[model samples]
Target: GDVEKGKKIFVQKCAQCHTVEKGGKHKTGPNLHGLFGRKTGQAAGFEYTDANKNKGITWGEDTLMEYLENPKKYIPGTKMIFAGIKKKGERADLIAYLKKATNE
Candidate 1:
């Protein structure tokens, strides 16, 4: 039930910055539509730091876990001011929640 559990975490932690819906307007962060295969720092209208702009990394389970563990350490100079999700269990749950989509 990580997807269900993680929804709470995501709403509290991610919704303010990122958008999980397709075609959603950019917020503090970018819309996360079809995030799975999307390249880092390249979301259309969102400005990204140089660190993330050319990060050349793609989103996936493992990479997401690493980044969630430490956004600063994962991509130093990233504009994302978050310290990261820290807890392994909660972090993993978020991944499961993020894995799905809004059928867009």
Candidate 2:
């Protein structure tokens, strides 16, 4: 997966709603700093839906790939508005970008 492409994908598809930098502000969605190894719906002060709060899944590459593909299906009642990234390669690239960006 190409991290550069992934960054571009994120800028196009996700930056409006989410932020990936450490201590970044929450947007329409949660700021995604330190996303890996964090539990779902645990961002401080963010009001998550019951469906998302109860999901109880940890963040990582595999889970993110599944969730990002179809957020509605993944959490079943998520409030996220974007449809999804249907391309497998794009998903992989996005994850790769997150792996680096969020960990910083």
Candidate 3:
């Protein structure tokens, strides 16, 4: 399933800093629970730049894929730390995993 492949990509790339549980602990990055449809930098208790505080974004397949392509490039001055997943399939996989995990 796409979700399984997505989980693998996320574990390899995103797991170091992000969490997918509801109200999960924040690492270097915010917990990604309910990330879809959530505004950027609005996760409670996670510190973020003022620039990122009001992107007016709702994370979804389109947004996540674009942001993950080159986060800083996508949102100038926002504080994301990965260069990006260059592979198209990997990006899709990661988003898939995120959607399922965050929903759970």
Candidate 4:
């Protein structure tokens, strides 16, 4: 699982709604820049669901992996509309990219 490959998939499927650069504005979804290490439902200026607000999620490798595997399963009221990533490899790769991107 390579970050570059994950980046491609992200651009194709997720970039339309999410931005990977810091301070980026919300598109259809909240900007995901610096998502790792941040508290869930804490993106400034964005509205959050009770499911996320009450859960007090702290985004990290393990938490992100679990959520990305099945977003609806993780947070039923989340506004994200995409179905969960079913493939383990793709999930791993996407997390890798997210880790790198957010860290940078």
lDDT, candidates in the order shown? 0.84, 0.92, 0.85, 0.84
Ten residues in a row with the worst lDDT in model 1?
95-104
The superposed Cα distance between candidate 2 and the true structure at residue 28, in angstroms, equals: 0.6
Order by lDDT, highest first: 2, 3, 4, 1
> Against the true structure, what is each candidate's TM-score?
0.91, 0.97, 0.93, 0.91
Worst 10 residues of 2 by lDDT: 39-48
Off by over 4 Å in 3: none
Whole-structure CA lDDT of model 4: 0.84
lDDT (10s digit) by residue, model 2, range 7-102: 999999999999999899998999989889999998787888999999999999899999999999999988988899999999999999999999
TM-score between model 4 and native: 0.91
lDDT of 4 by residue, 1-104 (tens): 69999999799878898887888889988888878878888888888778877778899878977888888899888888888788888888988898888667
Candidate 1: list runs displaced more than 4 Å: 102-104
Highest TM-score: give the candidate number: 2
Q: Tens digits of per-residue lDDT for model 3 on 1-104?
A: 28899998888888999989997999988898988888788789999877778777888999888889888887888887889888888888888888889999
